Structure 1
Amino acid sequence: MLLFCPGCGNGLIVEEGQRCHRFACNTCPYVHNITRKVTNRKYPKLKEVDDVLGGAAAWENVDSTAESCPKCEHPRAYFMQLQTRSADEPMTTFYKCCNAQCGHRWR
């Protein structure tokens, strides 16, 4: 905690006195002795997260369901549509057919 002196409003530091540690100013002889406990906590942020990911329920946050993939022709699907091509006027598809863990990845 930042403390200031009533004499000149400058910063107060801790310094060992002849009988007890005290707050003192580097410009004026104003001092203030310490009687009881004086604390100043900060309460930093605690890492409350667990960092779990990869669940099939959270993974299936996709639109395409019950389509026909060109690999195994099964309902399940996971499509990605991209439009970031100017040389190629049509769009771009990326299908991920995975129910029995096939791992289909093509264009």
Structure 2
Amino acid sequence: MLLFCPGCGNGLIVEEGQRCHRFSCNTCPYVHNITRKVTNRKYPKLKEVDDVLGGAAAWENVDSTAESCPKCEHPRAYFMQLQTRSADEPMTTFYKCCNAQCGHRWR
């Protein structure tokens, strides 16, 4: 990440001193000792998952005493939750029911 000197406002570089790593200016004496953990997270875009779960994938989220689906009122349906973008997104819930003479997709 860009961080800039309070004195002259040139761009800082990270270098190493005799006791700590420092943010340092190239044009003035200013240095800033890294005393504690500092971080910067990118969170890039993941792949699409839409065509990855279709067609009898290896899902696993089903559990004992799980709810029945609302149309058929039978537990013959899978349900899962996934991030669609990066993991800062709140996870979305989705479910699909597959029964005899009955095909549907629901949200």
TM-score interval, normalised by the smaller of the two chains: 0.3 to 0.5
Higher relative CO (CA 8 A, sep ≥ 6), structure 1 or 2?
A: 2
Distance 1:39 1:88 in 2: 16
Q: Comparing 80-89 with 95-104, which one deviates more in the overlay?
A: 80-89
**What is the RMSD of the two structures over their aligned residues, measured on CA atoms?**
14.3
Deviation string, structure 1 residues 32-78 (Cα, Å, up to 9, x no partner):
00111000000000113343699999999999999999999999999
| Greater C-alpha radius of gyration | 1
Structure 1 segments, 4+ long, off by >2 Å, are 48-107
The alignment covers a number of residue pairs equal to: 107
Comparing 14-23 and 71-80, the one that deviates more:
71-80
| Percentage of identical aligned residues | 99
Separation (CA, whole Å) in 2 of partners of 1:33 and 1:7: 16
Contiguous gaps of at least 5 residues in structure 2: none
1:66-104 residue CA offsets vs partner (Å, 9 max, x unmatched): 999999999999999999999999999999999999999
Deviation at 1:18, TM superposition (A): 0.8
Q: TM-score, normalised by structure 1?
A: 0.46
* TM score, norm. by length of structure 2: 0.46
